[PDB]
Ligand SMILES: CCCCCCCC(=O)SCCNC(=O)CCNC(=O)[C@H](O)C(C)(C)COP(=O)(O)OP(=O)(O)OC[C@H]1O[C@@H](n2cnc3c(N)ncnc32)[C@H](O)[C@@H]1OP(=O)(O)O
């Protein structure tokens with residue numbers, strides 16, 4: 001098989017040829033790709049908290065080297081492209097393009113198969129770094145969340161956040177209770193930890209937040225002592241001071257943001273970039289006209305109002321010192 005044949009077979013944009021050539025050069029992994037099957041696949045998916053509806057469909061559609069040779073060629077090389085960067089937070093998060101849905105369920109669940117095929121590799125890395133099993137597993141369960149999110153957002157099974165799953169799969173991101181932390185470095189190479197909030201796990205309670213923060217240094221200093229971060233950095237819609245206009249005092253976002261020191265400049269009022277991000281995280285926004293979107297929470301009402309009024313939301317960046 002060749003990258004042009006693969007590209008055309010799967011119906012990928014000409015845009016992706018460079019990626020495909022790169023993968024082509026890279027070749028198959030030393031350890032040949034293996035997909036768990038049947039009840040082994042069910043157990044793994046269940047452990048990764050993939051909802052049952054999706055897990056059944058994932059197993060049923062599992063591709064095959066002989067019947068799906070283009071898709072299988074990509075599966076091995078995409079797996080290879082991730083594992084070669086195991087432990088390496090300096091490499092860009094390149095998970096590969098999404099596959100056109102005309103390839104059916106195997107195409108839609110492509111990056112789930114990448115994730116399943118890569119679990120053994122990253123779990124070995126976890127073991128080597130002395131990471132507790134429950135931490136490793138808890139970290140990998142975001143696969144379920146992102147699978148469920150695809151369904152809510154689009155109407156059928158899939159997982160199109162493969163750029164993000166490169167972090168879990170390279171063992172450079174760990175969920176430590178309510179928050180996640182990623183190995184990171186600034187433009188000047190100073191190590192920090194990136195701080196992230198997964199959807200699942202309920203509201204962002206001060207006490208859960210605070211516990212996660214207490215876990216970060218001891219965890220990273222024990223298992224990645226070479227890193228030495230003192231500070232956590234976040235970029236998020238939820239760091240927009242403009243939220244103070246709409247959210248009240250019981251809002252966990254309003255209380256927690258107060259600890260943060262913002263480091264980017266106040267954005268231009270007319271800049272529109274942070275719009276799609278807040279829309280994504282609040283509504284899983286999929287192009288629909290704003291009046292259809294639910295209005296059941298103060299935040300839901302807030303983000304519409306603000307946009308209706310011809311105003312814009314921005315992503316802000318800030319830091320907190322790790323306790
Ligand atoms: C504060 C630290 C900043 C650190 C930077 C983090 C960097 C990133 O990870 S960027 C991505 C962030 N992740 C997400 O957005 C995940 C999806 N979002 C969520 O699950 C939630 O927003 C979550 C859990 C994080 C916060 O929820 P919660 O603790 O309820 O927020 P809170 O400020 O207390 O809520 C205020 C109101 O808005 C509602 N609300 C909050 N978030 C959402 C949401 N995503 N969708 C709908 N309604 C929401 C609440 O239900 C509450 O409603 P009401 O006043 O009507 O009772």
Ligand SMILES: N[C@@H]1[C@@H](O)[C@H](O)[C@@H](CO)O[C@H]1O
Nearest residue numbers: 164195196197198234235236
């Ligand atoms: N889509 C990702 C989220 O899944 C993640 O929680 C956040 C962390 O800042 O980064 C966003 O771009």
